[PDB]
Ligand binder design. Structure first.
Ligand SMILES: *[C@@H]1O[C@H](CO)[C@@H](O[C@@H]2O[C@H](CO)[C@@H](O)[C@H](O)[C@H]2NC(C)=O)[C@H](O)[C@H]1NC(C)=O
Ligand SMILES: *[C@@H]1O[C@H](CO)[C@@H](O[C@@H]2O[C@H](CO)[C@@H](O)[C@H](O)[C@H]2NC(C)=O)[C@H](O)[C@H]1NC(C)=O
Ligand SMILES: COCCOc1nc(N)c2[nH]c(=O)n(Cc3ccccc3)c2n1
Ligand SMILES: COCCOc1nc(N)c2[nH]c(=O)n(Cc3ccccc3)c2n1
Ligand SMILES: *[C@@H]1O[C@H](CO)[C@@H](O)[C@H](O)[C@H]1NC(C)=O
Ligand SMILES: *[C@@H]1O[C@H](CO)[C@@H](O)[C@H](O)[C@H]1NC(C)=O
Ligand SMILES: *[C@@H]1O[C@H](CO)[C@@H](O)[C@H](O)[C@H]1NC(C)=O
Ligand SMILES: *[C@@H]1O[C@H](CO)[C@@H](O)[C@H](O)[C@H]1NC(C)=O
Ligand SMILES: *[C@@H]1O[C@H](CO)[C@@H](O)[C@H](O)[C@H]1NC(C)=O
Ligand SMILES: *[C@@H]1O[C@H](CO)[C@@H](O)[C@H](O)[C@H]1NC(C)=O
Ligand SMILES: *[C@@H]1O[C@H](CO)[C@@H](O)[C@H](O)[C@H]1NC(C)=O
Ligand SMILES: *[C@@H]1O[C@H](CO)[C@@H](O)[C@H](O)[C@H]1NC(C)=O
Ligand SMILES: *[C@@H]1O[C@H](CO)[C@@H](O)[C@H](O)[C@H]1NC(C)=O
Ligand SMILES: *[C@@H]1O[C@H](CO)[C@@H](O)[C@H](O)[C@H]1NC(C)=O
Lengths: 771, 771
């Protein structure tokens, strides 16, 4: 099909407008490759080991609007220790001055000592994060007259130390009259640099050594929308990065008038500034403020008073998390009445207040916040809460009591990571959610959920629930669509478990292995019959090796996850009793029986499958053999996942095994060669992964072109390809096909013979085979 | 050193007396190898694919006392499905008649249709388990006149069906006048064969279809010591193998006088015979009975009466497990007073009686059993037990309440596997043990252990204990030496946790990841300081990535297991705070820090190790690099485990890195070659494992003979050895060395060049390299 093989080790993409995008991310390059198109608008060379840039680098590439050249020499402590960068990136004079249309230049993570000079006046975005530039001088910024976005952070901090204070000359940035975004985070800065251009919308000064704000510091910044001063005078208790507090337990000192000019301010972040008081006067001339982060201060007392809230009627989010007093376990949470001023508030987070008992009235300041959607009281060591108090919170989307000690999306390292916005080189959608995960609930009964019939998802994941559910425990939860009961100890003595949840669409009972791990106890896996609208059942990692019921039954269920169990034991060769375990799941479309130690599949398994099975996984089973002909029984099979097993062969004729099969995943097996007519007449096939096997040769008979050319994708990487004259067809076909084959640059490689060892097949000249 | 290389693919061992033991177990043989020594006494050829035996097989081997030729054609359902046996083993005439001294012949698992004829009269043991011989005729046993031990079981059952009843001619075995042991288990037998020779000591008739015992079936068996009739009329409820009960819920019917002749009987197994009553009259003329198994019957009621116990004053073990009535949850356990007649009883097991509440007086029948050592009341769904009742059981070695629902060694498939004696092809030693594992204990306090100060080991593994231990919870356990607290939710707010256990030698807090998995909670890992005689601490799989204490301290601790945590995060490059975490464990000799995602080791780690570290594991870390010179800091290092990582190199000179190092494990890495002088002057080295790497060449310089010849073991298997003329030394050395190198038969193999591919280096003739 293709007249000229793409030999360039980079992905190439058009988009008309008006971009030619060349992506060489992580291609182990030591040089900018030759042959990059002349029309290239966006060139990405991130994560390679290109030791320099010169006028030759970009000579022909005059239409470049963006160079992303990040992490070609990452600082020692941030980067790989197996392949350390020997010496800082070298940038020779006039390497960029030619690039008349260059709007964006990323040079992060290259150990640069200075702001590269000779940059073109078209430049809008310059990024220099994670270099060794720790002294900014007005003279070096004159080239940046038209610059709008300037990232200078992470040049002086514990992962990349400069061993001195950061220095910024007086008025360094003032004459940058178009600068909108300035980031000087993670830099050992000691004072807000001044005067700043008034054109700024976003100023990031967090994680620095600024002990005081002068009353003038933000005087002219009347366009500023985001200000972040977090992590100056940090709260260091249980900090999981090195942490130096301001001396004398001092807070970051901010004059009461410091923010007066900031009338456009939308976001103010004062996380981890050791604040003991939040003076109302701060917010006098800011009315448009939407997001305020006061997490990680010492505001426990202030939470009970908080007069400043009366000045914040447009505030959408408020974070007061991790303000607890050291060594104190409060009896209760004292929320000021001032919380009732927050007419616009959608999200309130008060993790880590740390208190024993939550009572209904303590939340009364929140009762009339009409727009409140999220109340997050996680990680509080709450021991006692009458859950019925949430009858007054039907309007909320999420009530998060996660990680508490109750008994009758944000990343998991969010509040405690160093820089949550550092650049590297779920049942909420069902409706109202009560997250009780990771608590101490050992016993449940109906009245625990009294007045909570509005709930659509309940998360009980990671409690201690160890009882014989009989259908009486959740009786009030008449609307519940999702129940996450994972990480408990479900005891399925009774097949009536869960049947009171009459609207239940999704049930997770994964990781309830405790009672399935024990011998000669009853287990009623036919409990599914009673749940008439159940769509998805997850029963992963339960170690299930025995069952009292021979069959699971459902008229509704579409997806069953049954991974990490012992069907190998249930289907012990010679025992027929459980071969139809899934057969009466009549609408079942997706079955995951990966990680079940199925070395082999007894005969009967495929006949036993329910008639509409579409997506079957047998991954990670140690399968050593597989009667491919038995796929004939699975008349609606579309996706078959046999990844990570020990198969040594493919079928003689795939078309003779299944007429429906579209996606066949055979990665990570022991396949040494393909059968002579493997894919012959397999017209349905659209996706074939044969990566990470031990294949030497592929001949045309096995891979007919009328089948290959309808493939959306064909994965061949990490095999043992022998590039002799017998491979002439494969090598040609690979070089000239339209079919998408990932990693042709990286990992489609001859292992021999000698001459061609280690070489990419895409680059292979086999002219000697046609003399 | 050796003049003639051992080329035979079998392990060969002398023992003077007077045995030449040739072991070819699992060597993928399709033929009996040539060159087996003529003096061979014991030849084992188990698990190979040798399709026949003939007079050539053993022609020269006239001193053979034993042939173990098991599983060269295992029945379809018991054996491998990837390599099924095509056709039953063929035994030609007169293959054994020469073997005049043959005392033992195992031919199990070969699909034999008949009892091999022409066997020598010296034969004492014949084993034919898992063949297809399901009709025994007196005529075929005339060859076995001197036989003592005859195993005929597993020839007709669900894993290897014959589709008919087993047949034994009248008096078939009678004229075998030396037969001591007869096993006809798992055979679809319908009646006790008669008459049996009176010389029998052991008779195994379990797992069969015998509905009745005739009163004379065991009349003449006055030497019989073991009788097993289990699994005839089985109790089939929650059976995890296919199970057909006798009709009408009938028991195995046994006349009251059936055992009268059995005066020597020591062991009687009546497991899973659906017995409702145990008539005293059975035991009238058996006084020497030591072991009785009555598990898996319907003896719940009978346990409360049990008059038969008065006839059993010499009984050592009694098993009454899994006698519960279906659908009944008794309030209490009713043990007859008759239990007090059991003067000799050491072991009593009553698992699966199934009851709610255990009370002190219910065990009073056991109060004066002076020899009682084990009381096992596991798997009973006990909800309530005042543990102080065990103040009356100081003399016991083990009190097992494992797998219950309390809240104030036997294999895990023991009671419910088909044939617990089927042949395939711990803190008890500290003193008194109370096993509370896998219960529902959510909260502990001191009084829970009142009157239990005698305890040496307590197993709390797998409870729900989720509290902030402060040193008050275990105060009475003044003698406790071992605490298994694994699989709980330890909350280490307080460094005083566990300090009341003043005699504690071993603490397991593994798999208490719950509170270490959460961010910005306190964790006092310095709790170790208070435990003055603590020798071993296990804190595996806790996911530990943060710690409030910088250092762990102990004057006593010798062994710390810290595997499955996140030291990679604690030692994040640039953070120095935790680099001395283990340093003040002054007597630490063994440290396991495998599975900690340590891609690299930051500098400081080895300087941070405590000074007497001997045994270090860094296995399974994905280590991509390792500064070998840093081993100089570990001045007492003896064993270093770097298995399962990604190391590509060894040190230039191992001796220059450590003077103390004796055992170096480098298996499962990516090592492609050895340094020129790798082991030069490494005089301390005794064990080197380089198996499963990618090594092509080993030269003499790297492996000097003065170092090699002090090695206890040297592992080289599963590498990528190239057998060219450059390998001449290695191939010679390997063939001629005394040094133990396992798997020379199986997996020390040339990968090339072409000519020698797949060939063992032991067998390699490289004469062309000296032509
Ligand atoms: C932040 O700047 C301070 C100086 O303000 C650096 O601290 C100096 O570091 C050297 C070498 O570690 C010491 O000998 C000096 O005495 C230090 N001075 C002070 C005042 O502490 C600090 O290392 C810088 N931080 C980073 C991460 O580079
Ligand atoms: C044990 O013997 C019984 C009969 O004594 C076998 O059962 C017969 O099996 C055949 C073929 O399956 C059937 O046609 C008959 O219905 C069965 N007869 C009866 C009376 O049940 C049984 O197959 C044998 N078991 C094994 C495991 O070999
Ligand atoms: C030892 O086996 C006893 C019967 O099986 C079995 N399996 C469970 N999962 C139970 N949970 C459980 O509580 N019991 C006890 C029980 C027994 C009968 C009636 C009511 C409660 C259980 N018994
Ligand atoms: C969220 O920040 C909590 C501070 O740390 C922290 N860590 C634990 N592991 C506790 N267990 C625990 O019960 N608490 C609450 C507490 C706090 C102070 C005094 C006594 C009890 C815990 N608090
Ligand atoms: C190309 O560069 C422009 C300007 O920097 C940018 O807006 C656009 O999103 C880029 N496209 C990419 C990386 O695909
Ligand atoms: C429930 O909470 C757990 C544990 O915190 C989390 O993994 C899971 O995503 C939640 N489940 C759902 C369905 O939201
Ligand atoms: C479920 O299990 C078995 C039948 O397989 C039976 O004992 C029980 O009554 C059944 N109950 C339901 C709801 O299917
Ligand atoms: C050798 O055979 C004899 C007779 O069967 C037996 O007693 C002995 O255990 C055997 N020795 C070994 C090591 O297998
Ligand atoms: C215990 O068991 C028997 C039933 O076999 C009954 O007769 C006896 O009286 C019971 N005793 C007590 C104290 O429960
Ligand atoms: C437990 O029994 C003991 C008698 O050994 C007694 O001291 C104690 O009061 C009982 N405890 C409870 C909680 O019933
Ligand atoms: C405690 O019990 C568990 C079984 O529940 C077992 O794995 C462990 O070995 C026991 N602990 C000790 C120290 O024997
Ligand atoms: C330890 O906890 C117990 C009970 O929770 C309490 O009696 C005691 O005061 C605690 N010890 C200390 C020093 O707080
Ligand atoms: C553990 O560390 C804390 C400070 O981090 C200290 O208060 C405490 O006493 C230490 N405990 C021991 C037992 O050394
Ligand atoms: C390593 O070898 C060099 C050269 O013999 C020597 O100077 C140095 O002391 C040696 N170090 C150790 C730890 O043996």
């Amino acid at each position: 099909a293709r007249w000229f093989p793409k030999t360039l080790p980079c992905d190439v993409t058009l988009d008309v407008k008006n971009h030619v995008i060349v992506d060489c991310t992580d291609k182990h390059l030591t040089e900018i490759p030759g042959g990059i198109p002349t029309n290239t608008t966006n060139l990405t060379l991130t994560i390679n080991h290109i030791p320099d840039i010169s006028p030759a680098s970009f000579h022909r590439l005059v239409h470049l609007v963006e160079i992303d050249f990040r992490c070609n020499c990452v600082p020692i402590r941030l980067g790989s220790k197996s392949n350390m960068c020997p010496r800082r990136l070298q940038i020779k004079p006039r390497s960029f001055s030619g690039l008349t249309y260059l709007k964006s230049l990323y040079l992060d993570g290259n150990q640069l000592l200075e702001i590269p000079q000779g940059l073109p006046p078209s430049l809008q975005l310059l990024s220099l994060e994670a270099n060794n530039i720790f002294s900014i001088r007005k003279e070096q910024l004159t080239e940046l007259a038209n610059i709008e976005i300037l990232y200078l952070g992470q040049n002086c901090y514990y992962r990349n130390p400069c061993y001195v204070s950061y220095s910024i000359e007086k008025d360094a940035f003032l004459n940058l009259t178009k600068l909108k975004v300035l980031s000087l985070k993670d830099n050992n800065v000691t004072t807000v640099p001044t005067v700043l251009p008034s054109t700024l919308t976003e100023l990031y000064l967090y994680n620095n050594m600024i002990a005081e704000i002068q009353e003038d510091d933000f005087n002219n910044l009347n366009q500023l929308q985001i200000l972040d001063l977090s992590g100056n005078c940090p709260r260091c208790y249980n900090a999981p990065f090195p942490c130096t507090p301001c001396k004398n337990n001092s807070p970051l000192q901010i004059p009461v008038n410091a923010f007066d000019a900031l009338t456009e301010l939308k976001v103010l972040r004062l996380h981890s500034n050791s604040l003991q008081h939040v003076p109302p006067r701060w917010f006098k001339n800011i009315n448009n403020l939407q997001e305020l982060d006061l997490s990680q201060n010492f505001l426990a007392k202030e939470i009970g008073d908080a007069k400043f809230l009366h000045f914040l009627p447009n505030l959408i989010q408020l974070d007061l998390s991790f303000n607890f007093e050291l060594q104190v376990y409060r009896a209760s949470m004292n929320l000021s009445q001032a919380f009732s001023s927050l007419k616009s508030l959608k999200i309130l987070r008060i993790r880590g207040y740390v208190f024993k008992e939550l009572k209904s009235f303590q939340l009364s300041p929140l009762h009339n916040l009409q727009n409140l959607e999220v109340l997050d009281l996680g990680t509080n060591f709450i021991k006692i809460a009458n859950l019925s108090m949430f009858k007054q919170f039907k309007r909320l989307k999420v009530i998060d009591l996660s990680v508490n000690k109750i008994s009758p999306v944000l990343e998991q390292l969010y509040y405690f990571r160093y820089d949550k916005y550092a650049r590297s080189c779920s049942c909420y959608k069902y409706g109202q959610t009560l997250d009780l995960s990771k608590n101490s609930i050992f016993f449940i009964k109906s009245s625990d959920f009294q007045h909570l019939s509005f709930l659509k998802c309940l998360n009980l994941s990671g409690n201690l629930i160890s009882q014989t559910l009989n259908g009486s425990e959740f009786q009030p939860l008449a609307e519940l669509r999702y129940l996450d009961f994972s990480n408990n100890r479900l005891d399925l003595l009774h097949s009536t478990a869960f049947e009171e949840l009459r609207k239940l669409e999704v049930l997770d009972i994964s990781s309830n292995s405790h009672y399935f791990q024990s011998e000669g106890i009853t287990h009623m896996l036919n409990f599914t019959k009673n749940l008439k609208v159940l769509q998805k059942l997850m029963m992963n990692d339960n170690d299930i090796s025995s069952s009292t019921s021979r069959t699971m039954e459902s008229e509704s269920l579409r997806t069953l996850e049954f991974r990490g169990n012992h069907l190998d034991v249930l289907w012990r060769d010679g025992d027929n009793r459980y071969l139809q375990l899934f057969k009466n799941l009549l609408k079942l479309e997706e079955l995951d029986i990966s990680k079940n130690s199925l070395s082999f599949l007894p005969s009967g398994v495929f006949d036993g499958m329910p008639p509409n099975l579409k997506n079957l996984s047998l991954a990670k089973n140690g399968l050593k053999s597989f009667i491919w002909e038995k796929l004939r029984y699975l008349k609606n099979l579309e996706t078959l996942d046999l990844s990570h097993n020990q198969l040594t062969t493919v079928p003689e004729r795939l078309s003779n095994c299944s007429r429906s099969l579209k996606n066949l995943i055979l990665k990570n097996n022991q396949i040494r060669s393909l059968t002579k007519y493997f894919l012959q007449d397999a017209f349905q096939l659209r996706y074939l992964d044969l990566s990470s096997n031990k294949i030497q040769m592929i001949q045309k008979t096995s891979f007919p072109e009328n089948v290959l050319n309808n493939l959306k994708m064909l994965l061949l990487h990490h095999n043992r390809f022998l590039c002799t004259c017998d491979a002439v067809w494969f090598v040609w076909w690979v070089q000239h096909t339209e079919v998408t084959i990932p990693y042709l640059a990286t990992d489609v490689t001859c292992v021999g013979p000698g001459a061609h060892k280690g070489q990419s097949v895409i680059s292979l000249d086999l002219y000697t085979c046609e003399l």
